[model samples]
Target: QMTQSPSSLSASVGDRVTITCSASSSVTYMYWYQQKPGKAPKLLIYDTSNLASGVPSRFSGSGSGTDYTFTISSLQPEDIATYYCQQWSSHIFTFGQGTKVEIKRTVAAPSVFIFPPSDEQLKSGTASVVCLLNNFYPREAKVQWKVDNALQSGNSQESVTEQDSKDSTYSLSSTLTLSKADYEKHKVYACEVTHQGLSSPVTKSFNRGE
Candidate 1:
């Protein structure tokens, strides 16, 4: 079994939090996760410090032996982002990645949304984007509009609704609006969904004009 200490900790907005994971055997791969106040955590690192695709460069990992460490090289405003660590050396699977290391003022709720409105018969804008999420449990969810894959600085609103089932499972939705002019040249927009528990987040995006 793998074990982690200080299951949780605190850090300044730009400071780094270190998580220590110990295993019974030599480990070859490690994974990191992040969870915000009302959002699902996301996979930041895998295979012993290899940054996952689309992850910001400041986030990094390093360690060896039965012990390992994950660090954020130089935290960013976004790096104020939450983090978690996990070891993949065993089949049973241990998740330190969902452990909350720092607590900061509640940031804006992460979300997903659509723009220029897609209804039954009309989809005539220069760009139309949709944000999709599943198994999410955030109070606020908004779709972020991005230009060239970079987050655009502006306010976008979200729509919320719920779906419940006999199996006792539930889901939610939110939409953010963006102008065609803003997204016309952009290739992708991101849907950042947040929740309270679980550190690994759920996200999906649509290509402009797709």
Candidate 2:
């Protein structure tokens, strides 16, 4: 059995933060993983503080014999995500529920900018709307479109997200097309983005004549 994990906390970009993990039995080997929302969890520490080369120096870990800790010296915007500790020394490997780090997520979701085809064409004709996922984190996201009150899975082009080297964050764009008949009847197009960073999908709605 594993011990109860610590609760999450809020921290600033430069704030130092620590999380602890406990094991019921004697612990010898412990590892840390930086799990971004949609991306795969990344190993940060192994065997108590021999940090992985791929990770930044901000991360550190130490512990032995049933107790362990992971720390970030000065949190960066990119450090805003989930983390977990696991021990593999014993016959039965175990991992904690994960410490979902609380960073302000100042960057938050992208500023949705809707680009539409000629308005006149969309009045009673086929037109497209390009919904940009602009700036977001962990990379992956699902974009959905709504016409009237019904859900639509199409006029949709979902693709891989792009990365911003400066902050290690990402951006993605999805486009949705609309039919003239639907537009004439409902007269509304709604776009909602689903990202792990968001508790609820961020939404943006567009109505004809807007």
Candidate 3:
């Protein structure tokens, strides 16, 4: 089994950081890769400490046998990316979990909000609520609906997402509908959002109003 420490990390500009990976058995050499969001992984090191073609001098690796260390001598603004280590010692390709690198700062994680059914929706005998997800970094997010703490399979629709050019954050809307009888029977209607920025799911809920 392969593992990585500090699965996620934040560092300041020009700060050198080291990421470590270990293998249960002996491995001759390891490979390292750098991956940015919405992009493919780029090889950085091959055969342990040797840098691949055009990789920068700041990025390097060193280690052997059971443990390996990947380091960034001087982090740069453009160096904000996830790094991984791969080994094929046992003739099977295996990779490290990954280490996410970010500039040392408070990251604006995903926020969840729930809107109660409007008068128009109530008039139709169907309660329709909206879950507004805002200010999430990264392009991907997942929305799940729960009723009375139980996961729901359907009755929800997630709309398209919009990204802000200024901050590169994303926002989207998800609507959940329930019949009047169904809505009254449930005590809590929740919208749960999962994103890369969050360590756990963010939830916002709605309750029936008199």
Candidate 4:
């Protein structure tokens, strides 16, 4: 069995968001799906981080052993629905509780940007990519990272989310530091944005020069 955090979230378009799903045993093939209030559920990701066709690139999956996560790099209005995680490694399938992405009409959409790192930033053989969100309503937002289109984990590549509350409109910032080897093989790095105004996430991808 697995569990989810917060249970529900009040989010706006352009916010980075994530949902955690865990299992009692190692799940070789972890799966994630999206559902609306009454509509049939659609497959989002399969076998961990393998996105389904017709689904936006912003939605991704990642996991190891018994833990897994379904993440949205950016929020879009139409994505304001419930999401669930399932496992298919064993003959008997099990699922985690659904996590809902909620929205408020008054909430303004935030703009998300991915700033490439300077040469100096790679001095340690690691490059730092910054994800920034500006002029968003409410203070709720989350961030996710992807390498070559696969979902990234918080371990080592862990990111910190910073927020400003008094700014009328909330602005959020996050950073991802990656080893040079990580990009040498994976040519693309993406930052996803999710929030109230977006039914789909907004995303930006950066390619490695080397």
Model 3 per-residue lDDT tens digits across residues 22-85: 9766636888999886779999999889999999999999886688899999977678778999
Q: Tens-digit lDDT track for model 1 on 1-210?
A: 777655555555566666676766774577778765466777888887798899888777776787777776554434433466676555666676345543343433233343434542134543334454444433344344554557655454434433212211224444445555655545665665555543555456655556
Please give the distance, in angstroms, between residue 207's alpha carbon in candidate 2 and its true position after superposition: 9.1
Question: Number of clashes in model 1?
Answer: 18
Per-residue lDDT of candidate 2, residues 8-76 (tens digit) = 666767888989888776536778888776789889998778989878888899876677889899987
What is the alpha-carbon RMSD of candidate 2 to the true structure?
Answer: 7.6
| Top-scoring candidate (TM-score) | 2
Per-model TM-score on C-alpha atoms: 0.43, 0.58, 0.53, 0.49
- Model 3 C-alpha lDDT versus the unseen true structure: 0.81
| TM-score of model 4 vs. true structure | 0.49
Q: Give me the displacement of residue 192 in model 1, in angstroms.
A: 36
Q: Which segments of candidate 4 are over 4 A away from where they belong?
A: 105-210
User: Candidate 1's error at 36, in angstroms?
Assistant: 2.4
Look at candidate 1 and tell me the lDDT of residue 128. 36
Better of 1 and 2 by lDDT: 2
Q: Over 4 Å off in model 3, which ranges? A: 105-210
**In candidate 4, residue 19 scores what lDDT?**
89
Q: lDDT scores for all predictions?
A: 0.55, 0.73, 0.81, 0.73
Top of the candidates by lDDT? 3
